[PDB]
Amino acid sequence: SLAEKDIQYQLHPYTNARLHQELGPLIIERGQGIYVYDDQGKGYIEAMAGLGSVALGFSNQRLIKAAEQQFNTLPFYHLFNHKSHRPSIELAEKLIEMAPVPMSKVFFTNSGSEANDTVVKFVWYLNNALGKPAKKKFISRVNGYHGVTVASASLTGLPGNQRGFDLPLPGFLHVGCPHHYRFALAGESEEHFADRLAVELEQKILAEGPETIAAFIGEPLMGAGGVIVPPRTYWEKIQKVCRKYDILVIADEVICGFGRTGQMFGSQTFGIQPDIMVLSKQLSSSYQPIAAILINAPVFEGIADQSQALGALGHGFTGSGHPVATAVALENLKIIEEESLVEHAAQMGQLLRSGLQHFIDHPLVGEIRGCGLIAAVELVGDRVSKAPYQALGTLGRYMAGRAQEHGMITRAMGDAVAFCPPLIVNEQEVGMIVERFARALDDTTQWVG
Amino acid sequence: SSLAEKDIQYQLHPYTNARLHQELGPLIIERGQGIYVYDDQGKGYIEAMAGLGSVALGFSNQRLIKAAEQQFNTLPFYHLFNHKSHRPSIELAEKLIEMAPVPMSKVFFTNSGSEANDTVVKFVWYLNNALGKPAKKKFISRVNGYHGVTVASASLTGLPGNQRGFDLPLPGFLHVGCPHHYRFALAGESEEHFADRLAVELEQKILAEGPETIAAFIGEPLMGAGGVIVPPRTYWEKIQKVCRKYDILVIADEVICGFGRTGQMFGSQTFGIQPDIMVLSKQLSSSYQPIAAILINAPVFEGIADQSQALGALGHGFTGSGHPVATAVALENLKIIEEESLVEHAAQMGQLLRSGLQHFIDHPLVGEIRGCGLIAAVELVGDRVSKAPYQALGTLGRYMAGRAQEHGMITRAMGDAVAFCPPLIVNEQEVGMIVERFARALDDTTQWVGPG
Ligand SMILES: *Cc1c(COP(=O)(O)O)cnc(C)c1O
Ligand SMILES: *Cc1c(COP(=O)(O)O)cnc(C)c1O
């Protein structure tokens, strides 16, 4: 069977390989709109838009035709050694012109992981160029997600990405997860919590030596880490501390980018003025692997000078700016703008968050959080202590399983069940997401007894 | 704003002097068909490099394009996380395992060769932690090897251009000698004696560092980006003996050699390598889609699988890992290579290419002609006795590549080596035209130098 071939031949990401050999895969055969279907014909609402990525859903014919048109023109070329092609140029123009702060240049990669890995290299290159060879350390947050390369998994603050992999590398430092529900002191306001987090960062900078800190990287809100919305004034106060010590501010917009948070960028929603932005996922509705780094004028000018001194910029992926991936991403961004999907997502997000808020006084619901069209419900075994049932992740695993039985694919991040549906979701579809959540919660409540 | 002006304004180019780019602007490629690409001025070029040694089936294979369409209209994205799967990833993994030149267990997909080698580093660290060998973590690679551009894979890479200014390599990424007889053999040393000395260098490096601390040796069977460096006779035999002696994994980076480049399906077959791990990309999809694949053997899989159970799940994966459109295109690509007998065809075309270039073997500027199958390089020198460059190293290569472009052919210079890596579908007349355009560039370069 196809399931037997999968067990025989494929090592799965983010999977227990031994349990996989026993249970085998859930094979997804086809998709349309917000739905995917398994090889048994069962339909599921993809309430996660795959990996928070399939902005236009699973059957956008404009994207598919844009791919075809580019395939029949030039199915591959590269950007190395002054070579270029129209789709990379037009996408770079569109990204610079839509940027929420003045940006200078785009550098393309295949993945968010490659993009953040590239940012690490470009910052080291820059500070070598500027004659600041000590100015190399990165600061990220506990539970931040920045990808899975040796370097980007060192930026990542999730233990699952580091345990067994000898990470983080030296020079990749982590400050606190800005989650008020878990880390605020008894009776501390969001603004007081923000103050204390800004103090933690400043103290980290001073303890390490300000001259040794190159950059601070953060997702405007933390996606994979559990839909962690930072406290009011966090980004204002963190940026003050960064500007104080000449530290680059990198906005990882891989999840927030292109209308997820109710504005085009999380940087807009949270008032971030980044030096560098990283984009992926919704950039192409994941129809093609592509990511993009936006760098501002000072970062470009330093890198450009050093590329002249060293002969050429000694960095690039075969797939960097791939003409089919860039053609698809260009068409994707045009549809998001033409169909007013940022404002549509914002409206659908209000319906999603209001629907979930009906469950705020349920005995297993610890917290409901989110912004725009991304949300999470954190389940607890006890609301007073905020303790898990059995161990962190038991409730989340059972909930996600019940949601799948009720025809909805959701992701558990510990005991948080996440929602990140396609931007094209309609009002009754939001209603059906909340209904399938409710059925899964009922099942989980009966199970915990 | 012209398209060239927008490119200068908005794009930071890989492997480009950004300041020179602001002055010269791009060469914009508009379209392609068969072995040809055309710039925005309508000038046609034979893509004698198949882009980046990658476009196996040329620039207008309609079967690949229809395979993409069919998959887009079925399922345009899904992932492989948390037991999820899809038919194209499964069928491609089956095809790759069943065609492997040694017994392999599992495939892990990535978007790029760089991600794939970066993943191999993580998987080897994970494996040796799983086996209770926490010290067994260092990698050995070669000077002028190319393994990609991430912080870790650029540490494996042995090309200075990939490390200078980037604070690389990381600690625990060690480099032994480039196996290029022409450049690094002692005066009057045989290929076999050179191979012995390189195997001694490796063993001495292993002993100096502590054998218990060395996890893996990674090499391209033949070194592509480093100048089409064919290892000396007996090199891979003797290196593998040293590796097996100290329980060091052998990783074959087949990103260029994979899928018929060297006259057999894999460079591991051509060079008699029995790797534990293979890395594949580029020709896997004819670069029509970004995809790479790691093949791991049974012992590597079993160790990783044990630890993934203990830790709850394997904490690694890319959004695009096994992308259904990329895997669908790669599957159709490998079917065409098998159905059209392109491995045997490439072997035949490579003999014509090498024979055509060898008409110039006693030219005063030709130092060496090297290659296997349908990959070749001509290394130009200013002086055949000393092997010294004309002017600075790289002058002849840059001049030749420029003249080739004027004569309607895209070649890559690696220092003073001019490389050939054409699409596998190149026909006999087209090989003739590649050698003719090389000859016109060489004539120009010879008139420019005046060796008299
Ligand atoms: C998805 C993700 C990444 C990694 O992207 P990949 O394409 O899977 O390598 C990086 N940052 C954030 C915020 C992410 O959500
Ligand atoms: C192309 C290349 C790589 C890097 O592949 P990318 O997809 O560009 O990241 C790795 N190894 C070898 C031998 C290569 O030629």
DSSP A12-72: -TTS-HHHHHHH--EEEEEEETTEEEETT--EEEETTHHHHT-TT-TT-HHHHHHHHHHHT
Q: Which residue has the tokens 């004034």?
A: A233
Query: In degrees rounded to 5, what are phi and psi of residue A366?
Result: -80, -45
Are the beta carbons of B60 and B33 closer than 8 angstroms?
Answer: yes
Are the beta carbons of A204 and A173 closer than 8 angstroms?
Answer: yes
Closest CA to A374 of A256, A282, A278, A267: A256
Taking the C-alpha atoms of residue B56 and residue B50, their distance in angstroms, rounded to an integer, is 7
Sequence-separated (6 or more) residues with CB below 8 Å from residue A176: A141, A142, A183, A197, A200
Q: Letter for the amino acid at B320?
A: G
Determine if ligand 2 sits within 6 Å of the CB of residue B113: yes
How many angstroms is it from B52 CA to the middle of ligand 2? 9
Q: How many CB atoms lie within 10 A of CB A165?
A: 21
Q: Which two three-digit tokens encode residue A372?
A: 């725009």
- Structural element, H or E, at residue A96: helix A86-98
Domain ranges in chain B with CATH number 3.40.640.10: 65-339
Are the beta carbons of B176 and B206 closer than 8 angstroms?
Answer: no
Q: Letter for the amino acid at B202?
A: L
Taking the C-alpha atoms of residue A59 and residue A80, their distance in angstroms, rounded to an integer, is 33
Taking the C-alpha atoms of residue A280 and residue A41, their distance in angstroms, rounded to an integer, is 31
Query: In degrees rounded to 5, what are phi and psi of residue B292?
Result: -135, 160
CB atoms B316 and A13 under 8 Å? yes
Q: Which two three-digit tokens encode residue A110?
A: 């295949």
Q: Which residue has the tokens 């054409």?
A: B422
Are the beta carbons of B373 and B344 closer than 8 angstroms?
Answer: no
Q: Which two three-digit tokens encode residue A33?
A: 């709109």
Taking the C-alpha atoms of residue A89 and residue B3, their distance in angstroms, rounded to an integer, is 7
Minimum CA–CA partner of B100 in chain A:
A9
Are the beta carbons of A254 and A225 closer than 8 angstroms?
Answer: no
B292 has which bridge partners? Answer: B110
Between strands B375-380 and A26-32, the pairing is: unpaired
CB atoms A77 and B51 under 8 Å? yes
CB atoms B30 and A321 under 8 Å? no
Q: Which residue has the tokens 């596998």?
A: B424
3-state secondary structure of B156: helix
Atom of ligand 2 nearest to the CA of B225: 15
Are the beta carbons of B192 and B175 closer than 8 angstroms?
Answer: no
Taking the C-alpha atoms of residue A7 and residue B85, their distance in angstroms, rounded to an integer, is 10
Domain A2-59+340-448 - what CATH class?
A: alpha beta
Taking the C-alpha atoms of residue B177 and residue B143, their distance in angstroms, rounded to an integer, is 5
CA B28 to chain centre: 24
Q: How many CB atoms lie within 10 A of CB B385?
A: 6
Taking the C-alpha atoms of residue B402 and residue B398, their distance in angstroms, rounded to an integer, is 6
Taking the C-alpha atoms of residue A252 and residue A250, their distance in angstroms, rounded to an integer, is 6
Q: Which residue has the tokens 């075309």?
A: B349
Q: Which two three-digit tokens encode residue B354?
A: 């090498």
Compute and round to an integer the Cα radius of gyration of chain B: 22
Atom of ligand 1 nearest to the CA of A144: 13
Are the beta carbons of A197 and A228 closer than 8 angstroms?
Answer: no
B253 has which bridge partners? Answer: B279
Is the CA virtual torsion A92, A95, A96, A97 positive or negative?
positive
3-state secondary structure of B374: coil
Query: In degrees rounded to 5, what are phi and psi of residue A419?
Result: -135, 130
Angle at A427 between CA A422 and CA A429, to 5 degrees: 60
Q: Which two three-digit tokens encode residue A352?
A: 């999603």
Closest CA to B115 of A113, A288, A321: A113
CATH 3.40.190.170 fits A65-338, yes or no: no
Between strands A83-84 and A137-141, the pairing is: unpaired
How many angstroms is it from B142 CA to the middle of ligand 2? 15
Minimum CA–CA partner of B155 in chain A:
A150
Query: In degrees rounded to 5, what are phi and psi of residue B400?
Result: -60, -50
**What is the greatest pairwise CA distance in chain A?**
69
Are the beta carbons of A169 and A151 closer than 8 angstroms?
Answer: yes
Q: Which residue has the tokens 């996989």?
A: A20
Q: How was this structure determined?
A: X-ray
Burial class of residue A390 (count of CB atoms within 10 Å of its CB; 0-12, 13-18, 19+): exposed
Q: Letter for the amino acid at A58?
A: F
**Residues of B in Cβ contact (< 8 Å) with A90:** 6
Taking the C-alpha atoms of residue A319 and residue B113, their distance in angstroms, rounded to an integer, is 10
Between strands A374-379 and A416-419, the pairing is: antiparallel
**What's the DSSP call for residue B442?**
H
Taking the C-alpha atoms of residue A400 and residue A417, their distance in angstroms, rounded to an integer, is 7
Q: Could you tell me the end-to-end alpha-carbon distance of chain B, in angstroms, rounded to an integer?
A: 48
Mutation target vs A (from B3, B5, B15, B291; most A CBs, 10 A cutoff): B15
A365 has which bridge partners? Answer: A379
**What's the DSSP call for residue B383?**
B
3-state secondary structure of B415: coil
Angle, helices A427-448/A341-357, rounded to nearest 10 degrees: 30
Determine if ligand 2 sits within 6 Å of the CB of residue B148: yes
Tell me the CB-side half-sphere exposure of residue A78, using CA atoms within 13 A: 25
Closest CA to B29 of A282, A240, A88: A88
Q: Which two three-digit tokens encode residue A299?
A: 């970062």
Determine if ligand 1 sits within 6 Å of the CB of residue A144: no
Taking the C-alpha atoms of residue A34 and residue B307, their distance in angstroms, rounded to an integer, is 35
Q: Which residue has the tokens 């090498």?
A: B354
Q: Helices marked H in B157-297 — which ranges?
A: 181-184, 191-209, 235-245, 267-270
Burial class of residue B278 (count of CB atoms within 10 Å of its CB; 0-12, 13-18, 19+): buried
Mutation target vs A (from B3, B35, B77; most A CBs, 10 A cutoff): B77
CATH number of B3-60+341-449: 3.90.1150.10
Are the beta carbons of A55 and A259 closer than 8 angstroms?
Answer: yes
B37 has which bridge partners? Answer: B32, B45
- Structural element, H or E, at residue B279: strand B277-280
Atom of ligand 1 nearest to the CA of A147: 4
Taking the C-alpha atoms of residue A76 and residue A61, their distance in angstroms, rounded to an integer, is 21
Closest CA to A137 of A31, A210, A203, A64: A210
- Structural element, H or E, at residue A401: helix A394-405
Closest CA to A57 of A344, A357, A261: A344
Sequence-separated (6 or more) residues with CB below 8 Å from residue A361: none
Tell me the CB-side half-sphere exposure of residue A227, using CA atoms within 13 A: 27
Ligand closest to Cα of A143 equals 1
**Residues of B in Cβ contact (< 8 Å) with A164:** 125-126, 129-130, 307, 311, 315
CB atoms B314 and A76 under 8 Å? no
Determine if ligand 2 sits within 6 Å of the CB of residue B253: yes
Ligand closest to Cα of A76 equals 2
Determine if ligand 2 sits within 6 Å of the CB of residue B275: no
Q: Which two three-digit tokens encode residue B221?
A: 């069977």
Closest CA to B312 of A163, A71, A27, A142: A163
Sequence-separated (6 or more) residues with CB below 8 Å from residue B232: B179, B181, B185, B191, B192, B194, B195, B198
Are the beta carbons of A10 and A4 closer than 8 angstroms?
Answer: no
Is the CA virtual torsion A251, A256, A257, A261 positive or negative?
negative
Q: Helices marked H in B100-133 — which ranges?
A: 113-130
CA B363 to chain centre: 29
Are the beta carbons of B287 and B259 closer than 8 angstroms?
Answer: no
Query: In degrees rounded to 5, what are phi and psi of residue A138?
Result: -110, 140
Tell me the CB-side half-sphere exposure of residue A38, using CA atoms within 13 A: 14
Are the beta carbons of B190 and B175 closer than 8 angstroms?
Answer: no
Whether the bond into B169 is cis, omega within 30 of 0:
yes
Query: In degrees rounded to 5, what are phi and psi of residue B173?
Result: -115, 100
Q: Which residue has the tokens 């510990």?
A: A414
Sequence-separated (6 or more) residues with CB below 8 Å from residue A392: A414, A415
Q: Which two three-digit tokens encode residue B369?
A: 């002609």
Q: How many CB atoms lie within 10 A of CB A162?
A: 17
CA B164 to chain centre: 21
Taking the C-alpha atoms of residue B52 and residue B428, their distance in angstroms, rounded to an integer, is 22
Domain ranges in chain B with CATH number 3.90.1150.10: 3-60+341-449
Between strands B277-280 and B292-296, the pairing is: antiparallel
Determine if ligand 2 sits within 6 Å of the CB of residue A216: no
Tell me the CB-side half-sphere exposure of residue B104, using CA atoms within 13 A: 28
CB contacts < 8 A (A, B):
444
Q: Which two three-digit tokens encode residue A255?
A: 């999840």
Atom of ligand 2 nearest to the CA of B281: 7
Q: Which residue has the tokens 């980044």?
A: A274
Q: Which CATH architecture has domain B65-339?
A: 3-Layer(aba) Sandwich (3.40)
Compute and round to an integer the Cα radius of gyration of chain A: 22
CA B153 to chain centre: 13
Sheet holding B417-420, edge to edge: B366-372, B375-380, B417-420, B412-414
Taking the C-alpha atoms of residue A387 and residue A380, their distance in angstroms, rounded to an integer, is 6
Between strands B84-85 and B106-110, the pairing is: unpaired
CA B208 to chain centre: 30
Closest CA to B320 of A424, A23, A254: A254
CA B236 to chain centre: 17
Angle, helices A2-9/B87-99, rounded to nearest 10 degrees: 50
Query: In degrees rounded to 5, what are phi and psi of residue A56?
Result: -95, 10
- Structural element, H or E, at residue B7: helix B3-10
Whether the bond into A102 is cis, omega within 30 of 0:
no
Query: In degrees rounded to 5, what are phi and psi of residue A21?
Result: -65, -30
Determine if ligand 1 sits within 6 Å of the CB of residue A197: no
Q: Which residue has the tokens 């807009």?
A: A268
Q: Which two three-digit tokens encode residue A323?
A: 């003409």
